[PDB]
Ligand code: MET
């Protein structure tokens with residue numbers, strides 16, 4: 001069954017986008033089988049064990065960290081979409097209202113830390129030290145901390161919606177895939193949104209030996225086609241941004 005392509009994906013939008021393109025791939029002779037995963041670890045582990053042939057869930061900075069940490073022999077088969085990341089809160093309508101010494105919750109995924117840092121910088125609430133390596137920025141790079149905010153980075157990315165829902169902290173950084181699955185719209189519900197999300201394009205990742213796989217190329221080409229990208233835009237109202 002070399003006509004069958006097994007793809008690991010996040011629930012929303014990723015798995016939904018995959019289900020929507022299935023008929024387009026079938027007209028091309030490719031049988032797409034989706035495995036939906038609820039976390040950011042098992043899709044990579046599954047790709048390495050051969051349980052799946054590709055995955056669709058992670059951005060390049062995540063991917064790079066994961067390849068280096070795990071010695072995964074993977075390749076990027078191509079960028080599909082962007083998820084501009086939000087800070088969410090049930091307490092404050094704006095970051096400018098947060099009392100000093102309040103906690104900002106972020107996940108333990110280090111590759112998202114520079115995103116929260118750009119939002120706070122744009123909001124005028126922190127500055128970064130001269131000679132920060134902005135590609136790998138962390139909380140230790142903060143020079144001015146205007147509202148003297150604390151950052152908790154212990155939680156798994158998959159529980160960030162619970163922290164929000166339970167009113168923990170002044171605000172919470174939630175990846176859009178989890179936000180959208182719980183019924184939050186980043187464009188309407190977030191109190192601040194990432195201004196430039198292009199470094200965080202979500203990719204199709206595969207094993208190195210499948211780097212020239214014809215079924216994979218067909219998947220990437222269908223996911224980047226104009227009809228599909230317009231569909232993605234209309235489905236989530238611009239919260240999910242096609243490349
Ligand atoms: C596993 S890296 C985070 C991926 C998530 N869909 C985002 O773009 O923020």
Ligand SMILES: [Cl-]
Pocket residue numbers: 077078079
């Ligand atoms: Cl690309």
